[PDB]
Amino acid sequence: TNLQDQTQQIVPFIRSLLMPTTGPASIPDDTLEKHTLRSETSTYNLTVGDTGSGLIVFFPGFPGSIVGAHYTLQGNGNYKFDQMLLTAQNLPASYNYCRLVSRSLTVRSSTLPGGVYALNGTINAVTFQGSLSELTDVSYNGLMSATANINDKIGNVLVGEGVTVLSLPTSYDLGYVRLGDPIPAIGLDPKMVATCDSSDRPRVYTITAADDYQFSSQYQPGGVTITLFSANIDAITSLSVGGELVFRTSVHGLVLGATIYLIGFDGTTVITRAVAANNGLTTGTDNLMPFNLVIPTNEITQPITSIKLEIVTSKSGGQAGDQMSWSARGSLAVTIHGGNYPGALRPVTLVAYERVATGSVVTVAGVSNFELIPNPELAKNLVTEYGRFDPGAMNYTKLILSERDRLGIKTVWPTREYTDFREYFM
Amino acid sequence: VPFIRSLLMPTTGPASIPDDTLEKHTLRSETSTYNLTVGDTGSGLIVFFPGFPGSIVGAHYTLQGNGNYKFDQMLLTAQNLPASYNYCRLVSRSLTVRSSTLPGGVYALNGTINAVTFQGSLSELTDVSYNGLMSATANINDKIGNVLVGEGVTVLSLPTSYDLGYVRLGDPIPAIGLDPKMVATCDSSDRPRVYTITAADDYQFSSQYQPGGVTITLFSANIDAITSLSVGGELVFRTSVHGLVLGATIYLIGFDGTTVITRAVAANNGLTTGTDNLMPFNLVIPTNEITQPITSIKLEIVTSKSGGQAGDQMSWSARGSLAVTIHGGNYPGALRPVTLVAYERVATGSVVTVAGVSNFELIPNPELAKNLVTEYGRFDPGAMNYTKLILSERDRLGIKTVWPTREYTDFREYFM
Amino acid sequence: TNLQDQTQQIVPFIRSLLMPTTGPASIPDDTLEKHTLRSETSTYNLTVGDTGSGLIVFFPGFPGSIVGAHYTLQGNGNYKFDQMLLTAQNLPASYNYCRLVSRSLTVRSSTLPGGVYALNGTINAVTFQGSLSELTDVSYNGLMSATANINDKIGNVLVGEGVTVLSLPTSYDLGYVRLGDPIPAIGLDPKMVATCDSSDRPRVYTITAADDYQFSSQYQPGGVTITLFSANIDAITSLSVGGELVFRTSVHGLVLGATIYLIGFDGTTVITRAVAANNGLTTGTDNLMPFNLVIPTNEITQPITSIKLEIVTSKSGGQAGDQMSWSARGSLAVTIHGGNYPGALRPVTLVAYERVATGSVVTVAGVSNFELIPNPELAKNLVTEYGRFDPGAMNYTKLILSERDRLGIKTVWPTREYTDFREYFM
Amino acid sequence: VPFIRSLLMPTTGPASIPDDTLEKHTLRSETSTYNLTVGDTGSGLIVFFPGFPGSIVGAHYTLQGNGNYKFDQMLLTAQNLPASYNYCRLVSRSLTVRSSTLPGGVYALNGTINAVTFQGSLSELTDVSYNGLMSATANINDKIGNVLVGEGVTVLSLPTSYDLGYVRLGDPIPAIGLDPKMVATCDSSDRPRVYTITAADDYQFSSQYQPGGVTITLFSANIDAITSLSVGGELVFRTSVHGLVLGATIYLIGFDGTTVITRAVAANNGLTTGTDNLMPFNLVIPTNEITQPITSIKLEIVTSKSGGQAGDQMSWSARGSLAVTIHGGNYPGALRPVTLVAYERVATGSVVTVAGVSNFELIPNPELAKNLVTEYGRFDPGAMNYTKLILSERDRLGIKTVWPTREYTDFREYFM
């Protein structure tokens, strides 16, 4: 395939929705705003590990320049993070706002490593209607029993034929999200950043960590470490943590220390942020540590599945054999900025492969169709205008999406079936 | 259809928006008039907020004999909307700026007008000068230049988005306290705008001891704010020199560069060596003390060591991230469409006249909802498609946002 | 006049060269290169002084955002720098290269203050084929003796009529000019700038400052200051000073210091840079101070007219009325980076106004057409392409400019003669 | 062979450029061939200079197991042209990147190619990865994606400018010296590129005493060099502490992060209290020390204290600005047009074959000019207008700078 950008190719909405490789249109709905169309590609040659198996989490509907992430299944039974898939152009560096019109990806392996003379490999895929940590079984086999819809899952497509991910809409009449763009700033630190993050429709978890949890342990050198909770969260962008815990004690000479851990999908620790240090407890008094954590977007290198609180307690001068004890009563509220905008976390497409030869490649190639608002430096030079009026396009989209089971339009295609559906729709 | 009559001619009256937000409301229309005296250089800037749901129409700035501006006042509406209403929604707005002096001869008085419609907020502009306004947009019909003040400029509010919820105005809720200066309101909160400022990344600071302490500015960053704001986060300090005392102060800086609000965030933090020291940030700033618009934020750090020897070294190391939250910031209209009207060197003793009409979809507070009847919008089919068609053909029909006023009179007679 | 910005309107080069407010065209020549067409306005309400007189020094042909400079005239016959006349869009912020296509300015004072019944003022205006500090007589009457051509000057134009300035070409087949564009760079100092300068066709002034020059004076406490030379130079953008002076003496214990001044058009010192610091001398041996100066563009707030070198000599062990003496032999060079580009300094138009009523205005309004090359952030999002082919345009331009004394085409027009010429050509 | 045939098909044979530059010369055609060995990950980056007037074709980089790159070699033409010629112009150039590995079965081997043509230099690219190449331009005839290595890509050189003079090849001049490894050349001088870096604008430094001193990096900036450069300017150091001494070093960093060239700029430079202290910069970097192209530059000041004591204070403050002249840097083709061809994950045991042909107009050195005849160019009127007619209508005819090899083969067949 000889890919070219289609951003000067004017197209109706109904073609650009189902065939996103044609070019961008604008979304016909009640949001009237001056904007700019841009069609953006993404080309990858993913590497096959030593077992032949993997997992390609796709994020269809994401209103920005993240497509997904690739993982390699290790030999012991775990996953290991390879890289996050992106789009071609870094969209925060030139545009403030964004809104996804359509998207289509293509996963295929057909090109025979150097000492190999036969082709091997199969593909299972679904489209799960929740976030990545919400999914209960992420195997190759158990991936299929994730949804009850027939059209949202496909089974044992050969890896040479390939699969095709199609982005069906999560909503309309949506607002433009704010891309995480730098704002002008000067500081004494040369590696100082400041961004304007995506903030409309946030996601808030609340975690009751302890409701009078009694602690009891003996003295040890260096302290005693427990883990107060290990709840699951969902994060591709920035996030903040708030709340408190309230401590009571009857033993003198205790100091406290807490830390927050953010664990990725593959199980490794992504971020360690210290919370308390040299926090001396006083008996007969509700004393407390507050939680004021703000984690920026660039700290996140891979997606995040869980969050964890470890607390290190140690007596100052007991030194031999004595008790240590405290109680905890508090609640904390984790806020994910822009977590409930439909598409940022909600539809998750998983494409897993098996049996593919070691050292072979799995080629992922796609094209995204956005609509944007420029930043102050690019708006001096580029023209924005309202969308071209087309009546009866929204009704025809509602018609197609309502009568979808009999027309056989699916969000996860075999490539040979998507191709002659496309040629019939031509 | 009465909606494009109320949209292209907002002095005619209000009409309800034909979209799918079906809520009981009442239509009200409110005027804003001002006779603006002119400065000693004759020049200045009028920033407009045309899509803004609320009483705030604009802001006035006068340009000094230097290059810097000076805040004059805030252009508001006739009556206060949060004193009698809870929710609000903008239908349309028109705003005329003219010099009401009328020369008695043939050659006119001094002063011309530039007028651009910038598609981002106020602090995102690069050049705010009179010449430098006409770079800020590349659209042919969002800017007009070199228009005489005797003719005038008229500013129109074209939509930024439809299907928008009603926004809560900054209305007083019933509250009692011991301080007679207590103000408790219910601010606009839907669609926040959040900044994240990684201020320090293992930054080191070293200085000689001085009496009183050494003050540095850790960062400065451009943010936009007209209403309630909040700062939260944490800086983390490590040191090895004993006996340091830390104190931080936040700042909010205006469009004229003058400091609006100073809040001492941390005071008398004593550092401990070999541990991990905390300076957590907890600020809420109410709307009632935002006197002018806010353009940037600053953070100053003042460190000092008890003991007092002139050869002493003080040193610490910093890392952290802080987050600034603008409540109701990413609502379309509250900050993003900004119209600037700059007049240069008008004659001394001249009067510049601002006069307009705004049209609303309001919802009354409970003491006045005993007397006002609210009801659903009057249904007309095809108003939305005809609005979409007229705005799709905006370039060929010559519908602008700023213009000369006589061109708008010729447009208005041709449209009626 | 209600100015609008026409860059979306194509035009031939003959209509854009003679009537540059119509729109931008592409220069037909053998410089074949992908570019974008950009046309820019510039509007000013200049303030008249207390005497009513002044001067407007334009720069027709400058390949950048600098149009000119305004100087008011003081009550004691001196001048005083008001401001720089610039283009609306800062072109180095978003473009890297630049050629000028056309330009057309208009000076006019039709409006008058609130109580005044009558309108005063007359204009002289000349086009001078040399640089700014080469002009010998800058008086109101002495402008007319700056050129011998019928069409490069006009006098006694009433200020309510106005004067129009048109830039006829100085050359063709010129390369583009590297604008003073910002660079990606990080440093410790937060107010760090680093630019890529205009450097094609530089200008060199060499100055033999001394040739066995003998100094002798009595001892004053602190030393005496003497001015070794001063010379007329020409600089708007960055320049460099390089060279060396070699000192030789026979009096024990002397301390030398040197400082370089740069003077504006009005006489005030723009830039001071020290060259020698405490620089002790040695008897019986030639010892030397070198010159290594780099002046960036943003240090220069007004056009530079002369350069000066003051040398401060001193004696460490003070004694009442003893002799001090030295000798000098050295030559230093000044390199105005990109000074010899035809248009950047070589033609200058001066528009002097007299007897305008005080407190009134003088209004400068123009249109400048360019051909530019975007920066790496804007070339992601803007289409650039080759110029439009029209044969015989270059020959017709050469014919028009060969017979300009017969056809009556001039650089300095009076207004409404340009209007009836414009309506006849249209 | 005419010019318009030699421009679009450079394998045909060389012609001379029809323009107003009449000079006795001789025209020439050179062929360069490189069989390339693919690294362990399988990916890399070939960076072509499609308009370079001399005999430097490109540079191979290899992507490692981490994110880093490694320099392989500078790809060159067949003969070293500065050994035998003085001056040059480039007429045309065409290069071809594919694998000559000819699969036996039905399916092919691993490997794809991206390719873009970027209109600025190499250190001006924001993202240089495989995926991030195809964002670097907006023209659809300057980028292509997922091209198989079995098909391959083809790079064509279209003009950046015409009516440009010759450039001096870096030929050696006759010289004698005591040192046997003495190099003296005459290199490219016309149309320089000058950078101005205000390195410190009243910066202030403060630190404790340490043995060996404290090293701090003053600035870092992205420059461009394939041939010789120089550095000039000063720094004025003000201090207040006795016994200080300074020493600086300028590093030139390659495209892969590796330090290419280090030069001691000043050393054992003592500071005097209360006066200015000048540290002038005078560096000349010849062409032969540059092995891989330079994309960055640093300055690192090592402060120290004479007669030092533990825990003792040392501090200074500096101002100054610097100049960096790249000789022959603003000449069109030396640095400004750059074509990048990135290949990813080619199969194990496969070779990538860079092979092409370049056409020149050359003037010999005086040892070879006594045996070749040099003459004026051939006269063909209308070749320049026909060239302009082809290039002005480039999108309707579909003439690209990067081609698939099969589509350029089809173009070549129906252009014969």
Q: Label each residue of D320-336 as H, E or C.
A: EEEEEEECCCCCCCCCC
Chain breaks in chain A (C to N over 2.5 A) after: none
* Beta-carbon separation of C188 and D120 below 8 A: no
Q: How many Cα atoms sit within 13 Å of C216 on the Cβ side?
A: 5
Secondary structure element (H or E) that encloses residue C423, with its range: helix C417-425
Q: CA D37 → CA A193, B130, C187, distances in Å? A: 40, 60, 39
What is the rounded CA–CA span in Å between residue A358 and residue A362?
11
End-to-end alpha carbon distance in chain A: 19
A305-326 burial by CB neighbour count: b if 16+ within 10 A, else e?
Answer: bbbebbbbbbbeebeeeeebeb
- The pairing of strands B112-118 and D281-285 is unpaired
How far apart are the C-alpha atoms of C344 and C347, rounded to whole Å?
A: 8
- How far apart (Å, rounded) are the C-alpha atoms in residues B222 and D111? 46
Q: How far is CA D265 from the centre of its chain?
A: 25
Comparing CA positions, the residue from D53, D72, D48 lying closest to residue D61 is D72
Please choose, from the candidates B142, B148, B193, the residue with its C-alpha nearest in 3D space to the C-alpha of residue B340: B142
Angle at C59 between CA C56 and CA C61, to 5 degrees: 155
Element (H, E) at C66: strand C66-73
Please state the length of chain B: 416
For A81, D62, D346, D349, the CA distances from D44, given in Å and listed in that order, are 22, 4, 9, 15
Number of neighbouring beta carbons within 10 Å of residue A405:
11
Identify the experimental approach.
cryo-EM
- A 10 A CB-CB count for D163 gives 17
Three-state secondary structure of chain B: CCHHHHHHCCCCCCCCCCCCCCCCEEEEEEEEEEEEECCCCCCEEEEECCCCCCCEEEEEEEECCCCCEEEEEEEECCCCCCCCEEEECEEEEEEEEEECCCCCCCCCCCCEEEEEEECCCHHHCCCCCCHHHHHCCCCCCCEEEEEECCCCEEEECCCCCCCCCCEECCEECCCCCCCCCCCCEECCCCCCEEEEEEEEEEEEEEEECCCCCEEEEEEEEEEEECCCEEEEEEEEEECCCCCEEEEEEEEEEECCCCEEEEEEEEEEEECCCCCCEEEEEEEEECHHHCCCCEEEEEEEEEEEECCCCCCCEEEEEEEEEEEEEECCCCCCCCCCCEEEEEEECCCCCCEEEEEEEEEEEEEECCCCCCCCCCECCCCCCCHHHHHHHHHHCHHHHCCCCEEEHHHHHHHHHHHC
The domain spanning residue D294 has which CATH number?
A: 2.60.120.660
> Are the C-beta atoms of residues B141 and B401 closer than 8 Å to each other?
yes
Amino acid at B306: S
| Contact by Cβ (8 Å): C312, C259 | yes
Residue C18 dihedral angles phi and psi, to the nearest 5°: -90, -35
User: Which residues are CB-neighbours of C77 under 8 A, at least 6 positions away?
Assistant: none
CB-based contact B328:B188 (threshold 8 Å):
yes
Nearby residues of D345 by Cβ (< 8 Å), 6 or more positions away:
A45, A47, A361, D41, D42, D43, D110, D111, D112
Q: Which helix (H) or strand (E) holds C80?
A: strand C79-86
Residue of A6, A7, A3, A15 whose CA lies nearest to A421: A15
Give residue A331's region: left, alpha or beta (phi > 0; psi -120 to 50): beta
Q: Is the dihedral of CA A197, A203, A204, A209 positive or negative?
A: negative
Of A368, A93, A81, A373, residue with least CA distance to D127: A93
- CB neighbourhood size of C100 (10 A): 22
Question: Measured in whole angstroms, how far is the alpha carbon of residue B361 from the centre of its chain?
Answer: 21
Q: Which residue of B has its CA nearest to D314?
A: B208
Q: How far is CA B207 from CA B236, B241, B312, D313, D315, in A?
A: 19, 12, 9, 9, 9
Contact (CB, 8 A) for B329 and B193: yes
DSSP code for C237: S
Q: How far is C238 from chain B (nearest CA, A)?
A: 23
What residue numbers bound the domain in which C252 lies?
A: 203-336
Check CB contact of D391 with chain C, cutoff 8 Å: yes
CB–CB of D167/D331 below 8 Å? yes
| Beta-strand relationship, A239-248 and B85-88 | unpaired
Q: Tokens at residue C417, please? A: 């003669």
Distance CA B396, CA B390 (A): 10
Residue of D203, D204, D206, D210 to mutate when probing chain B, most B C-beta within 10 A: D206
Pick the residue of D107, D201, D402, D403 with the most A CBs within 10 A to test the interface with A by mutation. D107
Q: What is the token pair recorded at C211?
A: 């040739």
> What is the number of CB-based contacts under 8 A between chain B and chain D?
12
CB A217 within 8 A of CB A314: no
CA dist D352 and D110 (Å) reads 12
Q: Which two tokens stand for residue C339?
A: 């000074």
Q: Of B172, B17, B15, B10, which Cα lies nearest the Cα of B85?
A: B172
Nearest chain B residue to A237 by CA distance is B196
- CB burial of residue A115 (10 Å; 0-12, 13-18, 19+): exposed
Strand partners, A289: A245
**Amino acid in position D335:** L
A93, D131: Cβ pair inside 8 Å? no
Please give the Cα distance from B346 to B42 (Å, whole number).
Answer: 5
Q: Supply the DSSP string of D261-294, one letter for each residue.
A: EEEEEEEEEE--TTS--B--EEEEE-GGG--S-E
Across the interface, whether the CB atoms of A43 and D404 are under 8 A apart is answered: no
SS (H, E, C) chain A: CCECCCCCCCCCHHHHHHCCCCCCCCCCCCCCCCEEEEEEEEEEEEECCCCCCEEEEECCCCCCCEEEEEEEECCCCCEEEEEEEECCCCHHHCEEEEEEEEEEEEEECCCCCCCCCCCCCEEEEEEECCCHHHCCCCCCCCCCCCCCCCCCCEEEEECCCCEEEECCCCCCCCCCEECCEECCEEECCCCCEEEEECCCCCEEEEEEEEEEEEEEEECCCCCEEEEEECCEEEECCCEEEEEEEEEECCCCCEEEEEEEEEEECCCCEEEEEECCCCEECCCCCCEEEECCEEECHHHCCCCEEEEEEEEEEEECCCCCCCEEEEEEEEEEEEEECCCCCCCCCCCEEEEEEECCCCCCEEEEEEEEEEEEEECCCCCCCCCCECCCCCCCHHHHHHHHHHCHHHHCCCCEEEHHHHHHHHHHHC
Give kind and range of the element (H or E) at residue C218: strand C203-218
Distance from CA of B237 to the nearest CA of A (A): 11
Q: Among B108, B111, B135, whose Cβ lies nearest the Cβ of C88?
A: B135
* Chains contacting C (3+ CB pairs below 8 angstroms): A, B, D
Residue type, A20: P
In whole angstroms, what separates CA B416 from the centre of its chain?
A: 34
User: Maximum CA pair distance of chain D?
Assistant: 82
Q: Which residues of A touch D108 (CB under 8 A)?
A: 111-112
**Measured between alpha carbons, how far is A237 from B323 in angstroms, rounded to an integer?**
14
**Half-sphere exposure (Cβ direction) of D69: Cα atoms closer than 13 Å:** 21
Closest CA in chain A for residue D407: A2
CA dist B362 and B86 (Å) reads 8
* Integer Cα distance of D228 and D289 in angstroms: 9
| d(CA B337, nearest CA chain A) in Å | 11
The count of other CB atoms within 10 Å of the CB of residue C193 is 19
Distances (CA, A) of C217 to B3, C250, C285, C321, C323: 90, 14, 21, 9, 6
- Note whether C58 and C236 are within 8 A (CB): no
Between CA C359 and CA A217 the distance in angstroms is: 86
Task: Decide: B380 and B121 in contact? Cβ < 8 Å.
Answer: no
Whether the CB-CB separation of C59 and C68 falls below 8 Å is answered with yes
Query: Tokens for C318?
Result: 């003070």
What tokens appear for C177 in the block?
Answer: 């000019």
CA distance D14 to D34: 22
Taking the Cβ of residue D207 and every Cβ of chain B, the question of whether any pair is shorter than 8 Å is answered with yes
Name the region of D213 (left: φ>0; alpha: ψ -120 to 50; beta: rest): left
Best CA proximity match to A274, nearest among A287, A286, A288, A291: A291
Cα distances (Å, whole numbers) of residue B146 to B255, C4, C408: 24, 9, 30
DSSP conformation class of C137: -
CA distance A239 to A204: 10
Q: What is the DSSP letter of C22?
A: S
Half-sphere exposure of B302 (CA within 13 A, CB side): 13
| Strand, coil or helix: C174 | coil
- D contacts of A1 (beta carbons < 8 Å): 145-146
What's the rounded Cα separation, in Å, for the pair B255 and B315? 35
CA dist A385 and B91 (Å) reads 21
Distance CA D58, CA D342 (A): 13
List the 262-291 stretch of C: residues with Cβ below 8 A of D. Answer: 274, 277-278, 290
Report the amino acid identity of residue D261: I
Q: Count Cβ atoms within 10 A of the Cβ of residue A227 and give its class: 0-12 exposed, 13-18 middle, 19 or more buried.
A: exposed
Which among B258, D389, B338 is positioned nearest to C391, based on CA atoms?
D389
Q: Judge: B207–D206 Cβ closer than 8 Å, yes or no.
A: yes
Cα distance between residue B111 and residue B99, in whole Å: 9
Using the Cβ of B217 and the Cβ atoms of chain A, whether some distance falls under 8 Å is answered with yes
Tell me if A408 sits within 8 A of A418, measured CB to CB: no
Do the Cβ atoms of C126 and C347 come closer than 8 Å? no
Non-local CB neighbours of C418 within 8 Å, separated by 6+ positions = C164, C166
Residue linked to tokens 């200066």: B181
Quote the CA–CA distance of B28 and B92 in Å, as a whole number.
11
Neighbours of A, requiring at least 3 CB pairs below 8 Å, are B, C, D
Q: Please state the three-class secondary structure of B326-346 as a single string.
A: ECCCCCCCCCCCEEEEEEECC
Task: Count the alpha carbons within 13 Å of D168 in the hemisphere toward its beta carbon.
Answer: 15
